[PDB]
């Protein structure tokens, strides 16, 4: 039984995949006039470049639905229009655009701009930071070539590929490249005859 | 007296390019004594102005009339007789540019001082004889008082 923590991936049914950046307390989460605090705060800078007006329409429809005790339909090339949900909001007493007067929880002063609140259907993905976290000590090696294994399940180490070697060469860290590719990976001492080679 | 300039101006336009900013407006004004033009950013929320408004404006080096140029730090809490008591709208800026007129290719005698009052631009243009005392990288006080 795992709890959502920093690093867990989440989706919002609109391809707006994100990762848990911070977990701020409820007292730190803003609050509206009714006292509702948001569970998830997403970045608005992702809307301009992606043109995800469908997410805003879904949020408004869900707000209207939870207010009027109904289930709006987001059918493709149809569904509930924006005017119906705006009428529902103005009838229930909320803003017809989703934006509501919200007060800052940290400073306790109202914000200069209204916040866009609403119920969104977020779904958690199987990508877990607890499973993706890896740290490789010396550990075992392979029989053929004495180097760390590949997979994490078999306790494998990371690979400094050709691109990493090229980056190190461009930087010019000769001793770093040597310690990486020779000392800490496949260091060994052989005996060579100076007569026959 | 550290008064570097003083003149009565009359507003001729409020927003030639439209209502860009809610709190700040770009007023264009012309002096009556001389041909001094002033393109100044003013805060209308705290100091409202109109089109046919006339105001006396004084740009001084220091805020104290006694001549003490000790302006290392300003303490708003301190109460003492100063020049701000005789005016209504006081700003603190720095003369950040002095540019001559480029319209007159020859025999030019007009200059223009651009001051930045914390971002608010003030271009005071006119004869150089009136801009005497204005120097670059010099902090000054502007005092505006509307008249009847």
């Amino acid at each position: 039984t795992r709890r959502p923590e920093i690093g867990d991936k989440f989706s919002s049914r609109h391809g707006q995949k994100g990762v848990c950046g911070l977990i701020v307390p409820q007292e730190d989460m803003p609050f509206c006039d009714s006292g509702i605090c948001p569970d998830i705060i997403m970045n608005p800078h992702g809307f301009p470049s992606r043109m995800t007006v469908g997410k805003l329409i879904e949020l408004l429809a869900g707000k209207a639905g939870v207010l009027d005790g109904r289930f709006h339909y987001g059918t493709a090339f149809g569904g509930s229009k924006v005017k119906d949900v705006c009428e529902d909001l103005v009838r229930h007493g909320y803003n017809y655009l989703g934006k509501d007067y919200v007060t800052s929880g940290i400073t306790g002063e109202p914000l200069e701009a209204y916040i866009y609140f609403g119920p969104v259907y977020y779904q958690k993905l199987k990508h877990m930071v607890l499973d993706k976290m890896h740290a490789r000590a010396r550990g075992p090696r392979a029989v053929l070539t004495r180097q760390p294994t590949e997979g994490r399940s078999r306790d494998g180490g990371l690979r400094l590929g050709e691109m990493e070697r090229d980056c190190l060469i461009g930087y010019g860290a000769s001793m770093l490249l040597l310690e990486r590719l020779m000392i800490s990976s496949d260091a060994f001492e052989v005996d060579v005859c100076g007569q026959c080679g | 007296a550290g008064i570097l300039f003083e003149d009565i101006f009359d507003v001729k336009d409020i927003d030639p390019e439209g209502k860009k900013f809610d709190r700040v407006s770009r007023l264009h004004c012309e002096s009556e004594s001389f041909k001094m033009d002033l393109i100044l950013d003013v805060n209308i929320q705290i100091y409202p102005v109109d089109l046919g408004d006339k105001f006396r404006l004084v740009i001084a080096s220091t805020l104290y009339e006694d001549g003490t140029l000790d302006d290392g730090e300003y303490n708003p809490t301190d109460d003492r007789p100063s020049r701000a008591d005789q005016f209504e709208y006081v700003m603190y800026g720095k003369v950040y540019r002095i540019e001559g007129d480029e319209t007159s290719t020859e025999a030019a005698t007009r200059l223009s001082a651009y001051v930045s009052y914390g971002g608010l631009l003030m271009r005071l243009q006119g004869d150089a004889n009136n801009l005497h005392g204005f120097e670059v990288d010099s902090r000054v006080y502007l005092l505006m008082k509307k008249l009847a």
Partner: protein
């Protein structure tokens, strides 16, 4: 295709090499006719927040 949620009513007796379940799954508020047809509302894979 990777969303986390319930698989079926026999998910407790089912024993797979790897399974992910949700504690308090909730059906979407904005559900589509395709959702109603496939009966995904009965086995949702997310929560409305």
């Amino acid at each position: 295709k990777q969303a986390m949620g319930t698989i079926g009513y026999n998910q407790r007796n089912r024993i797979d090499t790897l399974m992910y379940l949700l504690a308090y799954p909730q059906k979407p508020m904005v559900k589509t006719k395709t959702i109603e047809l496939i009966e995904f509302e009965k086995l949702p894979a997310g929560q409305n927040a």
